[PDB]
Amino acid sequence: KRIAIVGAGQSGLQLGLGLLAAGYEVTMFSNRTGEDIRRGKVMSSQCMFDTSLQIERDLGLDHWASDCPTVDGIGLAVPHPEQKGAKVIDWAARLNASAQSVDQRLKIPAWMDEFQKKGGELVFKDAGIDELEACTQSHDLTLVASGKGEISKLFERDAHKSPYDKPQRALALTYVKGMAPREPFSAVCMNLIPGVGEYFVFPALTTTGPCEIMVFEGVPGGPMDCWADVKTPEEHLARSKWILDTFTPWEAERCKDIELTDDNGILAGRFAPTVRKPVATLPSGRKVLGLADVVVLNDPITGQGSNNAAKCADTYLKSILARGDGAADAAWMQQTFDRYWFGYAQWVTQWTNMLLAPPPPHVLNLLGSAGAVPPLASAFANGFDDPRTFFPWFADAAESERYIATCAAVA
Amino acid sequence: KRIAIVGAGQSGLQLGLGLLAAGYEVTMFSNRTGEDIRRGKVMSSQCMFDTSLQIERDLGLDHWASDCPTVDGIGLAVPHPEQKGAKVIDWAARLNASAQSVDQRLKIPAWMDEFQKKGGELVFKDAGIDELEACTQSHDLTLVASGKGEISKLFERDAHKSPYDKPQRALALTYVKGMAPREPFSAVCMNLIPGVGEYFVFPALTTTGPCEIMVFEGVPGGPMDCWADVKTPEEHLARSKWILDTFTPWEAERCKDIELTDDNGILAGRFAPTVRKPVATLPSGRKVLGLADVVVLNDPITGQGSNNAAKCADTYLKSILARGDGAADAAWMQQTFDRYWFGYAQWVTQWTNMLLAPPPPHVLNLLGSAGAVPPLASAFANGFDDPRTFFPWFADAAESERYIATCAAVA
Ligand SMILES: Cc1cc2nc3c(=O)[nH]c(=O)nc-3n(C[C@H](O)[C@H](O)[C@H](O)COP(=O)(O)OP(=O)(O)OC[C@H]3O[C@@H](n4cnc5c(N)ncnc54)[C@H](O)[C@@H]3O)c2cc1C
Ligand SMILES: Cc1cc2nc3c(=O)[nH]c(=O)nc-3n(C[C@H](O)[C@H](O)[C@H](O)COP(=O)(O)OP(=O)(O)OC[C@H]3O[C@@H](n4cnc5c(N)ncnc54)[C@H](O)[C@@H]3O)c2cc1C
Ligand SMILES: C[S@](=O)c1ccccc1
Ligand SMILES: C[S@](=O)c1ccccc1
Ligand SMILES: C[S@](=O)c1ccccc1
Ligand SMILES: C[S@](=O)c1ccccc1
């Protein structure tokens, strides 16, 4: 009945709050105060699709549902190689239900407050092996939910589930006010620059109200791997507009008057996609269980990290509740992760890792056909809500052709 | 807001009831009266695992939860080729949450009564193309939920998703009272007879109270393809015991005093696993949407048909609710099925179709290792609740060995 969680993030707090509502005692370790999270740097573009949003709704945790702008579709654009400032692919499709991006600077601290108000024990410290040893002696289960924190490396990298050992994109975020709203519906506007990278943009909610989030991913060493010399917020805004001027002038038209939401609405960084083994053994021989990004870390190119966090925490919560008085031993830990991995996250991960590599011809054919076959475009858009639905037709040429034909027959 | 459903079965009635609760008008066609279903032949062994049961719970339709015996694990036995009346494999694993088998003779008629009481329009007729033409003119969406009925063949067989065009097992059911309860927990007791077939048995709820259901599947033309000469209920009980005496004497020990629950608690039959295209076009050019067994029909060897029916109806209900005022056109129909198929049922189907074929050596190695590696046995048992979790390790030798090793490391 006593559960410890190290890491006050999306998955950790969602899980902790669910556990409290089910009558558990929860101890949570945070390495930052709520206010410093609210006023510190952005951490994500956190676009959450309907299934993930519903997990939050069902826990009563959708506190921003009304104030957060909805994201109502997906758009895909590719520059025309032979026509200046034009697109050779330019289509959109509505999501069957809205997505929403609630800044973690808002959500995490408010969920920390809710966790305390609901009886959770919040302990402030940069937790290390010593805290894990203490927790495993006083609690029935200890989870590590520390995201990209250094303590996550306690869990052993799973080479067979990790095809990459190096970052595959250089990342940046810029939160802005004043962007012209997309008409006639909002979308994740995806701009695929062949051999260069990707620009994504969609509306969101941050600490100063509604905004849009510009998301940049660059092939390393390419023209969009361009944040090393950026050292001020003003330079970051400028480099953001420069990418749009240089590679997506149609989006630059929307950004004549953009300003940062705040000087901390910027980020630049990179990481290697990594899957880890879920059970870590401490020096004492006691065991801890890894949660969400600790065990499955994907590049954000597919916008799945916060979705994975919600769905991972939901699966772990269900597994804890079903266990009851049963031992929280390594076998149960491993089985809990396995259901998440084989049931769901292996397909999110395989899809994302394929998209990081150069697209093969059948993929370019799918993206083009989607502009002329609306049901295929819809499949693409709503696949973001459950990436299992891309298999087997996204990854195999012959199956992709069969699926295009299925889609064309009902257009 | 007006929906028609042809076929008053598990998926059709679950969907209809959900639609009524959401404020839709529902017309349903039934080819039998509730009472004739209650007192007619059994139709299934309908073992529903926790995720499917929860879909019913969330609609408030788990009316037998308290009276139906729980099924609390899975067991696997294989006869010893060199030791008389002994088993070379004999293991069991608990399900993380209970399964339950509520006879469709009970559930379907009670759900028909609930459907009328909740404002549904129940129309009694053996529906054909004429009723479909009428329904498609007076309703926004018409679904065909007719199971193994002849009208299901209106939907075009999908050859690429259907590796079989012939039955792969000869089936029989025998519902009995007086079987010795399994101790110390109930289970689906799976008896795999190499090259011959399978005997499954578990407790259930039928019209005369708790029982056990004996399920027989025989390789066609083999020793368990043995129901052609059976012509009375007494002969059916006798042939049931004969299989146990001949192939599973350890189960015969439990059946010294078994009697039929009723003369109609028996069934024999066979069918080819079949996947169909979900949109059918009527002579007028109007369109209908296929539901559950109409579009994805699997052999019962994996006990997934009623689970598929609950999960399919849940996905279709979610899709209808998200559509709102949107057109219920062929594109939307196809996309609704696609989410079900690519997201879930393709993996149930591939797994089941593999199990119907002779098991390759790595599969026999998995089944043996599970007897000595409890976490692998648990994976097997709980995979019945979500067969996606068998992939890729069940179907590939090298991956199966990796998963055995993962399981052994936490045993
Ligand atoms: C640029 C970018 C864009 C993204 N865009 C999207 C998107 O559009 N959609 C989407 O779904 N996902 C997106 N993601 C991913 C998403 O933000 C994360 O996957 C999600 O936050 C994972 O949740 P988590 O609970 O595993 O970790 P987090 O939410 O990161 O929580 C971990 C927390 O634990 C803390 N911590 C670390 N070490 C310790 C320690 N020793 N003791 C205590 N606390 C510690 C960390 O500081 C952090 O506060 C994006 C990520 C990035 C980097
Ligand atoms: C021997 C056997 C054992 C099984 N064991 C299991 C198990 O352990 N676990 C499991 O999950 N599944 C099992 N199944 C599968 C499960 O019973 C079915 O998959 C499930 O009933 C499918 O639901 P459905 O709504 O698609 O069809 P049904 O529940 O069969 O509903 C279809 C209904 O429509 C009626 N109908 C047909 N034609 C017409 C028409 N023209 N007009 C009106 N009505 C019509 C039919 O008579 C029937 O009443 C088993 C099946 C069999 C045969
Ligand atoms: C590169 S972005 O994530 C994408 C995903 C699917 C289809 C097209 C583009
Ligand atoms: C722009 S962020 O990386 C994203 C990408 C794809 C889908 C949703 C969100
Ligand atoms: C033949 S029965 O369905 C089965 C399934 C999984 C593992 C072993 C046996
Ligand atoms: C005995 S019925 O066919 C069954 C098989 C496997 C799992 C559950 C139910």
mmCIF file of C-alpha atoms in Angstrom, chain B residues 12 27 64 78 80 110 118-119 135 141-142 146 149 162 189 210 212 244 251 258 263 276 301 307 330 338 381 394 409:
data_model
loop_
_atom_site.group_PDB
_atom_site.id
_atom_site.type_symbol
_atom_site.label_atom_id
_atom_site.label_comp_id
_atom_site.label_asym_id
_atom_site.label_seq_id
_atom_site.Cartn_x
_atom_site.Cartn_y
_atom_site.Cartn_z
ATOM 1 C CA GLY B 12 -24.700 -5.715 -32.087
ATOM 2 C CA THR B 27 -33.356 0.016 -34.795
ATOM 3 C CA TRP B 64 -23.879 -11.570 -14.201
ATOM 4 C CA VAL B 78 0.603 -32.040 -23.118
ATOM 5 C CA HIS B 80 3.816 -37.644 -22.364
ATOM 6 C CA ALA B 110 -31.395 -10.080 -21.395
ATOM 7 C CA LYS B 118 -33.996 1.695 -22.976
ATOM 8 C CA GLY B 119 -36.001 2.820 -26.031
ATOM 9 C CA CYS B 135 -32.699 0.692 -43.374
ATOM 10 C CA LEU B 141 -25.849 4.361 -40.559
ATOM 11 C CA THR B 142 -26.739 0.679 -40.990
ATOM 12 C CA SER B 146 -25.122 -11.069 -38.001
ATOM 13 C CA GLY B 149 -25.385 -15.826 -40.575
ATOM 14 C CA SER B 162 -7.512 -14.739 -44.938
ATOM 15 C CA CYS B 189 -7.362 -25.997 -18.679
ATOM 16 C CA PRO B 210 -22.844 -22.562 -12.788
ATOM 17 C CA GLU B 212 -18.149 -26.087 -16.849
ATOM 18 C CA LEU B 244 -11.039 -37.552 -22.306
ATOM 19 C CA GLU B 251 -9.152 -34.715 -16.964
ATOM 20 C CA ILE B 258 -20.738 -35.222 -15.226
ATOM 21 C CA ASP B 263 -30.023 -31.362 -23.848
ATOM 22 C CA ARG B 276 -13.967 -9.617 -45.020
ATOM 23 C CA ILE B 301 -8.888 -22.108 -30.530
ATOM 24 C CA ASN B 307 -13.436 -10.606 -26.778
ATOM 25 C CA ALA B 330 -17.779 4.592 -46.956
ATOM 26 C CA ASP B 338 -9.083 -0.085 -40.198
ATOM 27 C CA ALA B 381 -1.754 -16.526 -19.595
ATOM 28 C CA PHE B 394 5.876 -15.992 -30.231
ATOM 29 C CA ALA B 409 16.284 -13.314 -15.453
#
